[PDB]
Design a protein around this ligand. Structure first.
Ligand code: SF4
Ligand code: SF4
Ligand code: FES
Ligand code: FES
Lengths: 635, 635
């Protein structure tokens, strides 16, 4: 097979060849077996919301033209999209909610493996929420922050504070005028599921306004998750590590942390260092913890744990034969891992009650027992390492250098070395003088339909040459790190002269004798909220709303419902937002026109649907430059 | 066309002939245009939970055999079912939540059109919840009940009290042992949406246990909705009225209330009597309010408002040409009504912010302005009546007599005339002696796939001849009322000798000089909770759990996600539960075996999937008789 048609990652290509000769089916094989995919589903023109279905509508031609109950294409498309947004928001609800409970347990003395690690962030969040701190114990402040987090999930006397306190007042005012401020996170999720059920909401604009509001519930969960993880585990600062399959070590116990919620995998990291001598007794050099997906991003950002792989290529880590354990929480885990494990020897371990996989070993993680749980898990990994003594492994000797840890606090601190009391001003100065053309956030997944990483790297290369400041999260950050976009040694090759000058000036003032990396890694998918914090801080410093800023987003290879929700809130907060795969909307021209055009008149943002990455880069540059022109800037 | 293949209701048949000659497309025409329906959707073997889809699995044959991410048929089927349960629960969340807010507003002086109408029910609910009443103002008790209702939507120090306080302790204990008690109504809905999103829960048993727990969140919303509606609007007592299209009157202003939440349509009823002379000034005899679906059931149960039609046949009320207005809240409204209105003259009016239909007139109902809103709405109806002066109409002269209003309180009161201080004992006595073989609850919708009412009437006839006490809600009650099953004049024809003797003894002791009707109408779909209250009271009186009682349920023509949720909680509380249409589960034998067999070992209940109604009646009788045998009773 030509493996480069599947993935642009050479380590992935090498493992695809191994999987092929060993007869191990991969995600790419399961995709091929699915073709041709259903065109009703692809276009959004299918409904299964009641037992009179399934209903479908022919995109073109003759009947069927309308659902059995009378639901039009507009209604069917908008209802399906709304449920996808609610599903995305629900994952972020679960992630943030878990962290809120963990913080509450910690400060109540119920979970001594957890603690307040970032006291400053705690007090800053309390202040933003209106919680008094003067003369209060940190534990009581944290109890109040956890209570406020849990309160945002349901209706109360205030709207969702993890929306209204994180966006500029002018933006909150626009959203409120259109009825878009969430009343409660789980409240909005449930209202979406109700209104999209049979015989309820049946007006495309009304449905889509509901979707915008639920996407802000997703934003609140993202921002709440980042806030609470930073309190518990530390706010990221710049770190240096490596990425790709070559971070695996044949002579070590290789343990991947995979999923999203690092609540236990932050603990796995710390415990793994304590069990080094137990690993050495078993014949290993040590325990080598590596990351997959956003749990991997979390521990990369906070501890420099190397990233093994991401998203669509996750099975390939197992194909090496050296992955002794894969420790799972939830979200973005291909359930194929449980069956591949039988072929590769890997011990796959689930840990969360609501996310089990038939055939995997389940360990019932509890914060109250986190260290004990981590030791049980790592001992299974050590046992597995011992079982592969003498077996050959094939780890591609392929890895890149990765500078990461660019939380918004870290970015502001780095800029403060150029201007101590007005840190955003050097960035704004360079936007104004054209050294920085604008900002682009790359976000979201890989998707088996797109050769892995091709859109992220093609678009990023064009933007960087045109002096765009590129930030990235999730598996977009994964794609860019695995292709060298987080290695400062590649600044000369990748970056336009203006951007290079700025990255160099910031780097030299931070004592690096070298530039910042070409792309700034801002963390996990919930950490898209960090990009919101940066952009809102810029808006406040400039006295304008986000829909006037030369800032865009690109979910260039989107897959998960999470990514749909994130793209939708990016639009809702005012950003031009590219999506590089087709969401199921093309079966309705009216819905497509709302999402790509008339929503501009509501929020100032809009979707740019473009599957060709060179064309998408041109459209993103045009959007940036239109914003520059609106501010009276050359472009 | 042979109209009896579409509906067994002769009034519906007559209007189908009119629709045909006038060129007005109906739900049956849109169904025909949809055939053949997609077999992947029919069997449950389709997934659109991420942008790598749509994925499908061939029920039999070759590839595709597995989803792109590795999701098996078991996982795909269970995830789709779970989302349907969550959607059903969300509708009941929205309905109950709305009523909780209405009660709070009323007792805070913010909505003087609303009030505490049933003070006794208020105090009984407060006592069941643990709320003190001694020495407290009714308004403060009601404020506390409304607060407790709203608290059950999110996590707190107690589980959902509208589950744990309404089922016997032994049942709560079984459910708790299996992890099935909901933590919060909207909490469970959101956890379902998370766990069913890509790369999360992927074990069929774990997924389905989550679904059982979310179905109890639906039960809580149902019971909360009935409780609060009874406080606000009165607990039903026996009433006499009529049903079917002949309740429309050519010389009156005909106004249908349609949807679920009678929050405003209870007001419409009261206001309509006040505007009689305005209607007379416009040339009408008066305002004739009639019911459709469960909002219709609500006002039938409390005020004897005649029921025009139900569910699948709702368009036919408009085809008469005499329906001047259709006043909509949410749920079960075919959106085709908005376009048919242009052909029939009817004014279709929406009233709830989250349920609009393109082309309908929207009036923004607010409790604070309910009387004003009702007058605006009824004045549109009067105007419409005037526009049809001189136009012929075709109202089928077909209607039945309906005795209804059998709340659980009403049933207990009726039985108390035979035994004042042990009212359930005469019912139990007659179960023991075989005069009553068991109880069957008919629930749920009609479905265009089934000739309308055919399953409800075929099954009911067989059960009644075998001395089963039949109770009914929703459009199952609608089907039975429209075919004479709520007219005591039909007891001799329909009922076995034992059941007739019991209905007669109760009727004669209630001063009727005649029996209770063949079937007891227990109300709307949320009022399935009343059947739960009756069955739980019987369980408590007998000292056994619900899974030992000779009680079954039949969603004989199910359609809405609501009906899936209700059927699932019927199973979860311990009942054999028939469903007369195919839910999308047959693509997975393991899931089917859980839902129809091994769940017995968890909750004592189980689904009986049977599309042939004669066979379904035999299977329901077998289930009843097995329960009788387990209690040592003849059968
Ligand atoms: S909700 Fe309408 S369009 Fe969807 S399956 Fe049911 S009848 Fe078909
Ligand atoms: S979740 Fe899995 S089965 Fe469903 S659409 Fe995505 S890849 Fe296909
Ligand atoms: S007809 Fe294929 S997605 Fe439903
Ligand atoms: S393939 Fe028809 S329901 Fe998806």
């Amino acid at each position: 097979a030509r493996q480069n048609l599947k993935s642009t990652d050479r380590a992935v290509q090498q493992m695809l060849d191994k999987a092929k000769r060993e007869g191990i089916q991969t995600v790419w094989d399961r995709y091929e077996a699915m073709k041709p995919q259903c065109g009703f589903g692809e276009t959004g023109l299918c409904c299964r919301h009641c037992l009179q279905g399934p209903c479908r509508i022919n995109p073109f031609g003759d009947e069927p033209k309308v659902g059995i109950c009378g639901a039009t294409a507009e209604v069917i498309v908008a209802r399906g999209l709304d449920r996808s947004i609610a599903a995305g928001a629900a994952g972020h609800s679960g992630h943030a909610k878990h962290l809120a409970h963990t913080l509450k347990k910690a400060v109540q003395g119920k979970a001594a493996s957890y603690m307040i690690k970032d006291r400053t962030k705690l007090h800053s969040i309390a202040k933003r929420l209106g919680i008094p701190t003067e003369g209060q114990k940190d534990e009581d402040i944290a109890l109040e922050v956890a209570k406020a987090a849990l309160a945002d999930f349901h209706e109360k006397d205030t709207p969702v504070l993890w929306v209204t306190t994180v966006l500029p007042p002018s933006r909150v005012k626009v959203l409120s005028a259109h009825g878009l401020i969430p009343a409660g996170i789980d409240h909005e999720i449930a209202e979406i599921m109700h209104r999209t059920s049979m015989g309820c909401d049946a007006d495309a604009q009304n449905l889509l306004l509901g979707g915008l509001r639920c996407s802000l519930a997703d934003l609140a969960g993202c921002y709440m998750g980042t806030d609470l993880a930073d309190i518990l585990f530390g706010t990221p600062a710049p770190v240096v590590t490596e990425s790709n399959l070559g971070v695996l070590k044949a002579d070590a116990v290789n343990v991947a942390v995979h999923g999203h919620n690092p609540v236990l995998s932050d603990i796995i990291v710390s415990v793994s260092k304590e069990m080094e001598n137990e690993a050495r007794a078993a014949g290993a050099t040590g325990i080598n913890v590596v990351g997959i997906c956003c749990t991997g991003n979390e521990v990369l950002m906070r501890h420099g744990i190397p990233a093994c792989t991401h998203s669509v290529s996750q099975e390939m880590a197992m194909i090496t034969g050296a992955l002794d354990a894969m420790i799972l929480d939830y979200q973005c885990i291909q359930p194929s891992v449980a069956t591949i494990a039988e072929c590769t020897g890997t011990t796959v371990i689930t840990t969360m009650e609501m996310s089990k996989i038939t055939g995997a070993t389940h360990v019932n993680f509890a914060e109250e027992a986190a260290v004990e749980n981590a030791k049980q898990i790592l001992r299974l990994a050590i046992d597995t390492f011992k079982r592969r003594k003498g077996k050959p492994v094939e780890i591609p000797n392929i890895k890149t250098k990765v500078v990461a840890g660019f939380s918004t606090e870290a970015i502001i601190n780095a800029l403060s070395k150029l201007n101590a009391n007005d840190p955003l001003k050097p960035l704004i100065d360079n936007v104004v003088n054209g050294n920085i053309r604008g900002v682009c956030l790359f976000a979201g997944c890989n998707n088996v339909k797109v050769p892995q990483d091709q859109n992220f790297t093609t678009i990023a290369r064009k933007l960087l040459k045109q002096n765009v400041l590129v930030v990235a999260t999730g598996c977009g950050a994964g794609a860019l790190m695995r292709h060298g976009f987080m290695d400062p040694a590649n600044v000369d090759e990748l970056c336009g002269d203006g951007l290079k000058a700025v990255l160099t000036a910031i780097g030299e003032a931070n004592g690096l004798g070298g530039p910042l990396p070409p792309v700034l890694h801002m963390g996990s998918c919930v950490d898209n909220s960090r990009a919101v914090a940066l952009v809102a801080a810029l808006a406040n410093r400039l006295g304008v709303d986000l829909d006037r800023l030369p800032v865009v987003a690109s979910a260039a290879e989107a897959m998960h419902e999470a990514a749909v929700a994130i793209g939708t809130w990016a639009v809702t907060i005012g950003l031009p937002t590219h999506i590089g795969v087709l969401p199921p909307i093309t079966g309705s021209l009216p819905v497509t026109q709302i999402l790509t055009s008339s929503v501009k008149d509501i929020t100032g943002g809009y979707f740019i649907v473009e599957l060709d990455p060179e064309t998408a880069a041109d459209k993103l540059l045009a959007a940036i430059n239109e914003r520059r022109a609106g501010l009276g800037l050359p472009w």
